[PDB]
Design a protein around this motif. Sequence first.
Motif, PDB file in Angstrom:
ATOM      1  N   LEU A  25      94.154  31.816  74.653  1.00  0.00           N
ATOM      2  CA  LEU A  25      94.161  30.370  74.441  1.00  0.00           C
ATOM      3  C   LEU A  25      94.768  29.643  75.632  1.00  0.00           C
ATOM      4  O   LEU A  25      94.367  28.519  75.957  1.00  0.00           O
ATOM      5  CB  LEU A  25      94.936  30.041  73.162  1.00  0.00           C
ATOM      6  N   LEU A  28      91.725  29.258  78.292  1.00  0.00           N
ATOM      7  CA  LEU A  28      90.449  28.590  78.062  1.00  0.00           C
ATOM      8  C   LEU A  28      90.525  27.082  78.248  1.00  0.00           C
ATOM      9  O   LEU A  28      89.518  26.465  78.614  1.00  0.00           O
ATOM     10  CB  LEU A  28      89.917  28.920  76.669  1.00  0.00           C
ATOM     11  N   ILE A  43      86.487  28.541  71.747  1.00  0.00           N
ATOM     12  CA  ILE A  43      87.888  28.155  71.866  1.00  0.00           C
ATOM     13  C   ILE A  43      88.433  27.705  70.520  1.00  0.00           C
ATOM     14  O   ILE A  43      89.572  28.021  70.154  1.00  0.00           O
ATOM     15  CB  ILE A  43      88.028  27.056  72.930  1.00  0.00           C
TER      16      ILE A  43
END
Length: 65
Positions: A25, A28, A43
Amino acid sequence: MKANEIRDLTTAEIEQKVKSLKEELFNLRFQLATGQLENTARIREVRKAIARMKTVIREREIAAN
RNA sequence: GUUAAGUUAGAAAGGGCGCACGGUGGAUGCCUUGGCACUAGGAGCCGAUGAAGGACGGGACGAACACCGAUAUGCUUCGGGG
């Protein structure tokens, strides 16, 4: 991802995969703020996979107490 | 042809009325996305195991609503459902 992760052992098999997806995370949004990313719905699905993992150990703490 | 006296209609700068054709306008006519009134049945309290209310925030998509709290536009699992 349920029986995939219910069968995982409590200690690091969630936790390192928690930590890796935190790092995933982490990566992205850098591609998206630049605009160099295409599959943006993944995502959303990554954090969708994050929140279902932190509730596993928290459920297992209830299984402890 | 002319002179004289003599009547005697016309005009419209613009307006008055009658119809014809538009414009603003939102009344009516009809409808309902919500109301009020009750009847019948159910429920009549939630909180230091942190309320009601919020404030601040959460999406690939901008602010606000609605939904939802850094597990943030669901999450797991239990049934329903196709």
